[PDB]
């Protein structure tokens, strides 16, 4: 086991012997690389030890596939899970640095975007920590999505540079390479098997990122694919003639599959690039999974045993091509019959749904997919045809009307002709969501209410047919990254009041804080912990936003994707309201009527989403005006934090007092940031939707600020709008006027306010009900104000958040998947 | 100091902890990577120790710049120079491999092409070994020139894959990065300095390759530049719209500068790419050199002392832009006056010429260079104008005719107008060779005769003007790579007969073999050494060419660039002759009249050089026919070895009996393979040109087979041809007829024989005098036959080659450059 002495030598050894810099001096960037390489040594011993037990045991292994992982920085979670935090800190002191400054050099791995990606990242930590044999498979994106610049003009986008020097975590596996084919033609050989020939051939190379469990040796992989072409595909003859671009066409074509996350797909070229990404991920992974299955099998290879050895989870519909890809391999490559290969594929694959309404469910042009993946389209057509025969077999054809409904709704192919049928220019599509439901043995939503909606409204017919595939797995986040490592002072408190350090594993012990919520010593520690965390943030806000704020103010935080439906605009409108009120009062009245606040916004706008980009500019202009107004001073600051990512979350969430989750009611499946906020003793204000419902139930309805229309009323209120029956509240008109009056400078906001007016019209008519919800929202912010002035009641609420947060551990989620869907069991790594 | 035990641990440590493969098993590719990383640990300790002494001493340092380095494999020369060969061999045995199989995994560094590149590589070994503070600067070419495939159709070209997995030698210096500008505009600031703004900006990143000296710690760098663009230059907005190619234009543009060696430049785009390559190399290097000069200087920076601290050698005219680049930096960036910066530039820079006639001397379109490098063109124009004023100042203007001659010949700018002058549509060019002579303080040829030609015929006027710049530095090759490490059995012999291992440093002790050339014990060892080396080659010829040959045959070798002027066609024609004679004789007569031979060819043809490609196909067809003819059997084999490179040279040269250097007399400046052949006891047959002249003089005229027209007669014989006075010898017509008769299969050779006929016409008329030289060549091969049957006389000749080879050590060459041009001195690394 390393100690400070051996870690000291180890960093020095890497600094000199695995250098990435000049040999002079030991600057911070050099120190971070040497440190991380040192940690990797530890990760690799454990990774190899886990790898060896898994190989010999040949137990069932799970595989979690996703277009995104939001891994964050690795250093502090890795030394923490290894329990070497102390030793690395002391070793860095010896070499003249501190831990925190060295950790600051690490770029966030830009491998994901939002909650879908952080959920997968949480899950990997949970799997490793719980000794579950499972890996992650994703793509290695060179440039992420974008790094966000916050200028005078609002948001600007720049390519991420996280791999500009390389990652000291990843391990290239030069011998783990899989061929990926696109386009080409299918024919039949004299063996009666299909053979897919020609098109474009590329290679997918494996890059492992070791994921260490907490207090265990289990160290699993996140295996990422990077796409390339052998150097032999460089066309010399072209290059030498002066056609430099034609010479590299094959490499250009291969490499771009892994440039960015979710490449813009309004164009044909963008759509093709998206299918290529999904297919690469499904093909490379399954090829890798099958190859490991054959290797562990030895001579005793029973293809029958494949689903007893392999689970594959599809995170959303992006991994959908797994179903026809596994079918392809079994049938075309392994020689299985259709029936055998379908039974196998079904008992292998499971689908998790993450969306609310049947309109974000992905669909592909038939012609497009047929050009790119001819063999996959044959297989899907056959799956569709069996489905048709199965639907006719139940239900019969006495209802014709009932049969037609079922066939129309449930078929994978849209706007197609039936095989055989009875009665005596729309574009042909492939419904990925239909495929996923048909092709696996489990389908789960991601919250109680959500999973009920999936059974009742997304796939009702599928549930009437196969009620037994449908399940719920409520999301969760890891308390390692999201309490133990991001919030040390609160961790020290939890350990004291619960009696042990055991809570990080047995997170149910957070419940033992409830009996102390009114205890005055607990409360005092609780407040000093919160204040200390906010002091760290004050320094951070100074360097990142340029504004100096005080820690004796409520930190009111709204961090998430910028979208009209997320309702940043509501929050900022509320802010503008209070600022208007402040300005029409004396100094003395201002202090009696409003508690001091720092309102922190962060999150990225999709770059061609004009309105979202306009909301960002808006927040920055409201902040320029408020934060410089000498009548206001430290009563109110509005700051927009550039480039929100896991590292910024880990800073902000420990420090937060109030966090806002105020999307239009009914449009969130779950959300997970609210769960991290609760764990850290933040109090949530929000609408009754998504994860807010479950949080509110666990933390108690007195420790949550609720407001707004509920899901069941959205329909009616939008009808009111359309008929002209909607009466905007005057305070709402006040803010509107105030913005047009130009109080926020010279920028013209007409286009923005216009989105809130009219009664119909594509992007007008206040579709997300900002104006409606506004009175109950501003009202509820006054309840907050009142609660915050009662420091004792506020602390009690803050503690009960942390106390009622245990069920939101991704350890709970992962045990559920492990028992109810994947049927994997813990494996000990001695 | 490492031993077998610590090297064992070290390989294991890297195998597990700096992995590039899967963790299963220890296959050869894994073993080579772990081994090389282990060696690098040793190279790095010494490199850092050398770096530290150089930094503190701040003595004068030399810099050798070249478009090519032909580094070969590094492993065996590195463990040899470190003296760990034994320890690494034993360590590999312990882990179940042998040294020779592990060394076979290493790709040759594809960083060069021909002798110009191997000379630089020899020089780096010599500098390090002699404790001279000097570095190499070159480009890091990803795909080399091409990897040569030898098929049924002759030569095919494929991109080199040497960097497909990465190099375990190189060290990326992420903090050593220099901006390179192209295009743009020049203006004047209010300080009166020129400012070069706009165009295209890229970055050149440093990759060090440590070069260890023999039996010393001095370990120097070959620092290679690789070109790139910050990830910020990736155009997201384009990428997201579907314009994937436009999005990466800047990276595509930057990266291609380092794809291949000598990109085809018939097109504008190819020419631009060549200037970009040269400029990148001169700019990045000088920026690095100057930055190190300022850093070592501290606060005491005297720009006056720069040429007392820095020598820059230009290997040929490709580094020519160094002259205006240094001028640019001093003037525009450092604020020096013109005069000061010109004095400095002159005492810094030196030019080595490598070509014979004033027609391969490089020239650039004025307009082209002006578009790409506007500021450099201003500076060159000013240098030209001073030259003009200087020429007028000597010579005066009484001869007008004499003055005009001088001005026309010597000016850097061709087809330009004079500033001022007196008398009362050709494209404007920049003569790089004129620039190089004007801009440095030394000019050297590369052999006695050559350097005399440079003074008398290439730059006569420059020599009449500045006789003192002109010098000679006869080339040499290193006896580490080219005796001690490629030919172990011969090394054991040299050590025994000379009394010590000291010959590897004091290579003059090879002369002590002369007194033993007739000694029968020396001769017996000598023969067993040669035979043993040929046994290694027999195995190699089996796997690479597919032909099985016997070691009891003279190995007759011709390895070099395939070119009409190199005269492979003569050799193969001689072979075809003897084969024709063999076939018209009985078995018994065949054995009396011809000694058994294995005729080995190798070398690359420029890909669009139709004739050269046709000569390769020819040799392969002659070999298919001879090698399969049951009348011939092991009397004669003709094999073409694919992909000749340093690794193939190191195999073939130790094994060789006769090597052929038979270019048209007068067209070689030097050549260096002939010197390596001599060192290994090969006997040369050749024309009286280049290095052959000097070899023949040292080894003795009885130990060299000479034939052919001499340089002074080429002119006359080509005139004979043109006037119709040339009478082809009948034996030459025999071979011609025999080829057309289709004895070499179905390929049509008309186009090839046609190059030998007619009296004029671009590519006919036997310009390189194959037909002329043919009788004396076939005659001289019979003298060889006769000498080879007298094993005693043959051995005596073989030994006197090795005995008379010392002066061809690049250690001799490097001491000469060090004292006579660069004025650097040895620095001890304790």
Author numbering:
A (entry chain A), B (entry chain A): 23 to 446, 511 to 916
Show passages lifted from the paper.
Starch phosphorylase (EC 2.4.1.1, α-d-glucosyl transferase; SP) catalyzes the reversible conversion of starch and inorganic phosphate into glucose-1-phosphate (Glc-1-P), playing an important role in starch metabolism in plants. S. tuberosum phosphorylase is the first starch phosphorylase discovered3−5 and has served as a model SP for biochemical studies of plant phosphorylases. The most significant structural difference between the Pho1 and Pho2 forms is a 78-residue-long peptide insertion in the middle of Pho1, termed the L78 segment. The stPho1ΔL78 structure reveals that activation of the enzyme occurs through the proteolytic degradation of the L78 segment and the association of the two remaining protein segments to form the active enzyme.
The free structure was solved from two different crystal forms that belonged in space groups P3121 and C2. In P3121, there is one stPho1ΔL78 molecule in the asymmetric unit, whereas in C2, there are three. stPho1ΔL78 structures from the two different crystal forms are almost identical, and since the structure from the crystal that belonged to P3121 was resolved at higher resolution (2.2 Å), we focused our analysis to this structure. stPho1 is composed by 916 residues. The crystal structure of stPho1ΔL78 has been resolved at 2.2 Å resolution and revealed similarities and differences with the mammalian enzymes. Except for 23 residues at the N-terminus and 66 residues of the L78 region, all other residues are well located within the electron density map. PISA,65 size-exclusion chromatography, and native gel electrophoresis indicated that the biological assembly is a homodimer. The dimer interface surface is 60,640 Å2 and buries an area of 5980 Å2. The monomer is composed of two separate proteolytically produced segments, the N-terminal (residues 23–446) and the C-terminal (residues 511–916). The two segments are held together by 27 intersegment hydrogen bonds and 288 van der Waals interactions. The essential cofactor, pyridoxal phosphate (PLP), is attached by a covalent Schiff base linkage to Lys762 in the C-terminal domain. The crystal structure of stPho1ΔL78 indicates that the two fragments are complementary and that the enzyme native conformation is unaffected by the break.
